[PDB]
A paper describes a structure:
However, recent high throughput sequencing analyses identified a high incidence of somatic mutations of critical histone lysines into methionine (K-to-M) in multiple cancers. Other histone K-to-M mutations also dominantly block the methylation of their corresponding lysine residues, suggesting a similar mechanism of function. Moreover, we determined a high-resolution crystal structure of [name] in complex with an H3K9 methyltransferase [name] and SAM, which provides a detailed mechanism for the role of methionine in trapping histone methyltransferases. Nonetheless [name] is inhibited by [name] in vitro and its SET domain is highly conserved with that of [name].
To further understand the contribution of the aliphatic side chain to the interaction between [name] and [name], we performed binding assays with an H3K9-norleucine (H3K9Nle) peptide. We found that H3K9Nle also enhanced binding of the H3 tail peptide to [name] similar to [name] (data not shown). We also solved a 1.9Å structure of [name] in complex with an H3K9Nle peptide and SAM. The structure showed that the norleucine side chain adopts a similar orientation as the methionine side chain, with a bend of the end methyl group. When the methionine was substituted with Norleucine, a similar bend of the methyl group was also observed. Such bending increases the diameter of the side chain to enhance van der Waals interactions, therefore explaining the increased binding of [name] and H3K9Nle to H3K9 methyltransferases.
Author numbering:
A (entry chain A): 921 to 1090, 1095 to 1184
B (entry chain P): 3 to 11
Write the structure that this text describes.
Amino acid sequence: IICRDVARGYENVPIPCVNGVDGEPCPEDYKYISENCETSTMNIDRNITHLQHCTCVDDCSSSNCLCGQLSIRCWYDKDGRLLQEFNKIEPPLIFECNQACSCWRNCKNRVVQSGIKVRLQLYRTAKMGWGVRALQTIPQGTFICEYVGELISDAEADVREDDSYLFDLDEVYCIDARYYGNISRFINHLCDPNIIPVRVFMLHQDLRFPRIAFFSSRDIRTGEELGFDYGDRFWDIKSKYFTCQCGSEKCKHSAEAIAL
Amino acid sequence: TKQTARLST
Ligand SMILES: C[S@@+](CC[C@H](N)C(=O)[O-])C[C@H]1O[C@@H](n2cnc3c(N)ncnc32)[C@H](O)[C@@H]1O
Ligand SMILES: [Zn+2]
Ligand SMILES: [Zn+2]
Ligand SMILES: [Zn+2]
Ligand SMILES: [Zn+2]
């Protein structure tokens, strides 16, 4: 109701921005992109002959699907949500079906590659700047969005002046959503998170470059802020500049908890 | 230990 779509039509659904808290205009100090970009020589391995793929002529719901087997099993139910018994603490690598597979584009193992389905909103929070919340009920296990931005080396990330939007992919590579990013750059840290990041492979299987997919870790109410646990590789550094405002009774990074 | 903050899975 301040901006009708911060994604400028690049996502399956519009992502509006509103501010009912202070006077800050909807953010524009970044470039919205819906897929990861490169700014240097990366040479992602896109060799189609390198892709592990399945020979299924059904909808890939069977345990014989190789792509499922690479994932230990396919973790998506008939509605494309993670199984309840999915390891939310230590997620497996997910290998979705791809362009080398025999199956059709509508098979059951292509959730993340199909993009955003739920209604989300960029909004102004009370104490953590901008954040992202749901405009609908979101059952546990639902794909939300991908952490998208600028692919950079470990070495490059570590000389980045702004280290508020760096996501480590595993000697490793990093997604910096500071200058280039999607709606996920706006998701805040919660010590009692309702979404989890998962490493996924789709159109390539270059293990240096998993793509980061957020799934709901429990049922989410309309209007609830989305957030994940950023982890200690973030807060070890960042807590010396600011403290956690998630307000949870289990908060691990508050001004208080650090003092206690 | 790195010089910059990194979110992680
Ligand atoms: C990936 S950005 C999230 C979007 C950010 N709120 C914004 O307005 O652009 C991470 C930054 O948001 C702020 N932030 C995220 N979670 C926070 C939290 N739990 N408590 C205080 N600040 C938080 C911190 O400034 C952090 O560096
Ligand atoms: Zn298959
Ligand atoms: Zn397949
Ligand atoms: Zn398939
Ligand atoms: Zn907290």
